[model samples]
Target: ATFEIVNRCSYTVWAAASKGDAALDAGGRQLNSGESWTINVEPGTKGGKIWARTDCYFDDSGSGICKTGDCGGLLRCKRFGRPPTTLAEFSLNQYGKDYIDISNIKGFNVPMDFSPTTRGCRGVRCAADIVGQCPAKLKAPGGGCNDACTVFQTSEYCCTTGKCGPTEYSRFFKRLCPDAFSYVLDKPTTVTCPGSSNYRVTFCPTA
Candidate 1:
């Protein structure tokens, strides 16, 4: 299946993808507003992640800092990004189905949409004004909203013990973006599509 990453935000973003040792778009690359990049996803790829890095400035050698979603200060990421990043996660060709979701578990930097373009599958979105309406305690430095776990690091928020429920903080995120994965054990956010369906991830997507 093909994965298309689109940037609709007014500013530039450094988009990154992490799928094992595979380098998607050279791991990461600069994406100005209105730009798009397509990635090929082989079958049986599990736990793959794609997200955007904001407020970034990379030098000619592809090294720099991103206020949000920085990964080892490299243009090409070797692992998952830092916190306060909206994520589009997927497991392709798993038992004949493709599972996909837009996750805010790391909290939200950019509004996003994750949907299948080929199949008639339902899409997920998190386009709420989370950063502007973020609670003071959950606000991060780069105009991003931090999840409760990132801010507090408590078991209740982190679900480190494998037993936890929704808190006010998680609920707040859920209320704003009901279709997104708001917490570790979040409910019904992942959608299943036909295995051959192509997917699209749009940052700062419109309503």
Candidate 2:
């Protein structure tokens, strides 16, 4: 007998499955957000395991294993259960502004977002001295100016020479990592910096 596997995730998936308890194998090709695959199966095959992998952006970080939960909740499976003897159906829907809902067996929809809330620095903020000294118009390197220690008051002045000009880095730093400059400023970081000079900033999360 032959069966069809369909993907209803918001994005493409690397899927695999197998008969019974056997280790699942790759389905042989990439399955797009709304794609399907047909495969041959022995008539008597028992329960099989079906799974998918994808590199879609999650929250603000790179991709990883899709989250698991009720289809309508964050990180839920889009679909689950044994494939139908002939054809099976699945779909992805909007659960929230930041999440995708994966429906399995029609009633069991799982909400998943490829995008993850990233906790670290990305892009030029990941760079070095560029965070404090790079020219205002010039882009910083990766990893620079992301850490609280990098932007706060110390030996580094707030672009006093205008070489780096005035920017948003310090202001946003205080907003995101308040305690970051506490020891140096002799005061706790406030929710909002009085101005740009008091905060450290980084770019919004990206895939």
Query: CA RMSD for every model?
Result: 1.3, 20.9
What is each predicted model's overall lDDT from 0 to 1? 0.88, 0.29
Provide TM-scores for the models. Answer: 0.96, 0.26
lDDT of 1 by residue, 119-159 (tens): 56888999999999999999997779999998999999999
lDDT of 2 by residue, 114-134 (tens): 111232211111111223452
Candidate 2: where is the Cα deviation over 4 Å? 23-29, 54-207
